[PDB]
A paper describes a structure:
HSP70s bind to extended hydrophobic sequences in newly synthesised and partially folded proteins, in a manner dependent on a cycle of ATP hydrolysis and ADP/ATP exchange. The two main cytosolic HSP70s are the ubiquitously expressed HSC70 (HSPA8), and the stress-induced HSP72 (HSPA1A)3.
To discriminate between fragments binding in the adenine sub-pocket, other sub-pockets in the ATP-binding site and/or potential secondary binding sites on the HSC70-NBD, we screened wild-type HSC70-NBD in parallel with two HSC70-NBD mutants (S275W and S275F), which block adenine binding to the HSC70 ATP-binding site. The relevance of these mutants was confirmed by their respective HSC70-NBD/BAG1 crystal structures, which showed that both mutations overlapped with the adenine ring of ATP in the ATP-bound HSC70-NBD/BAG1 complex. In addition, we confirmed by SPR that both mutants abolished binding of adenosine, ADP and 1.
Author numbering:
A (entry chain A): 0 to 381
B (entry chain B): 149 to 260
Amino acid sequence: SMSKGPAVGIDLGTTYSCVGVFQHGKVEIIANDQGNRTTPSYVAFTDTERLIGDAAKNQVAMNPTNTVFDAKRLIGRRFDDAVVQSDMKHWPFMVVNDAGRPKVQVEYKGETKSFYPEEVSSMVLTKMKEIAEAYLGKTVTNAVVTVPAYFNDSQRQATKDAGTIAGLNVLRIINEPTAAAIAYGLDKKVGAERNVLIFDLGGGTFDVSILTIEDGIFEVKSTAGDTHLGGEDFDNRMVNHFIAEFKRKHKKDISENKRAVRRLRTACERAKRTLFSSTQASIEIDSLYEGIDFYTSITRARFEELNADLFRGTLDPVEKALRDAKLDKSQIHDIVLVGGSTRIPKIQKLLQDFFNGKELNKSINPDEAVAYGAAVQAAILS
Amino acid sequence: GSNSPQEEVELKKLKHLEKSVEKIADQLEELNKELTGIQQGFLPKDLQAEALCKLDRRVKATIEQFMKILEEIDTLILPENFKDSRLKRKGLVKKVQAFLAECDTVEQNICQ
């Protein structure tokens, strides 16, 4: 058997999770068995087995009703919560009421089974624990797990319970914006009280948090955002643009052909990523629809135009959080970028311009900053 | 007759994708033989429905594997001068699409 390993930091995300470890004086974000530094927060139930992470996400098209995700949207909530009722309409899996508490209901090995959200999140946490052990070659038990700043007592407790069910010794539960500030060493900056704005646009949610750090104490001053905003919305604008382009060029509508739309959507997702660092992206899809080859391109400028209202709209929760925190924008000492969509240059430009040219804390991979801070906290608590 | 060493790289990528398609096509071939076997076989008419619907998981897995191949082929960018690569890419996508049509035929014949 393996020897005892270090404590880890885990970012349990709505769509993806990330695990880091502090060692040799730095944080190492751990790649999973497929070499991915983030792992889908997905659990699938099949005729023969339970699948977690990439293996679960990879078969979603094959088994949609029995592939659970978004458990974080349900954890610690009552069935009648407005959020649960609104969210349920859009999920392919069933959510049932068990004495006031939501449960996901699935078919597993030919039988009807139901799980509490913390049981689903415990399975994701077990995979994160296993990812850390496979990399370290040592057993992992101790972890710092993160939660959104707006989580209430029930949501926080249910997350701690997911950790316990997973066999983790949860050293501490810390807020996601606090983990991001810790990653950048914002509590270590000398001087007076610091006002920090965390701009977190990743994994299908948009969260703005304002924190004040004074003598190493973090206080959440305000939170704002959009629960359902992310990369998929930006990808969809591109898809609409291309479907319209195909109609103009060929007088054919590819929208009802699910495989054609999927090939196009996958290519749009990739082009969007190319646009993070390139000003243009090319797409070549042979035989997209009715044997027609679709060879096209999109500039970063066109991508920005298609998404102009959505990008400029990210400043509304920034203004709302500033008003709730009773602070002028000029009073914000540090701006931190978290989440994959913050890689979009236009989003960075809009935020930097809003803060009158102020440099943004963005050097840490945005997808990993929260796990990075959690791993730093885990090392401190060891 | 201006064949470049650069195109050899793309042709090698396409050959690997062709090999990957051949493996999935072997899975489809077994599904087709099993479907034919059930439709033309001696199973009591009462047990045929169950045998056919047992192919569901495999046919969906086969469809998904082909869709992942198409998404990988869709990442290639081939200049006009790479005529051999473009022809190989076109031929491969057409081969995958014809296999997906065969998968769709299996789905029309099971779990009805």
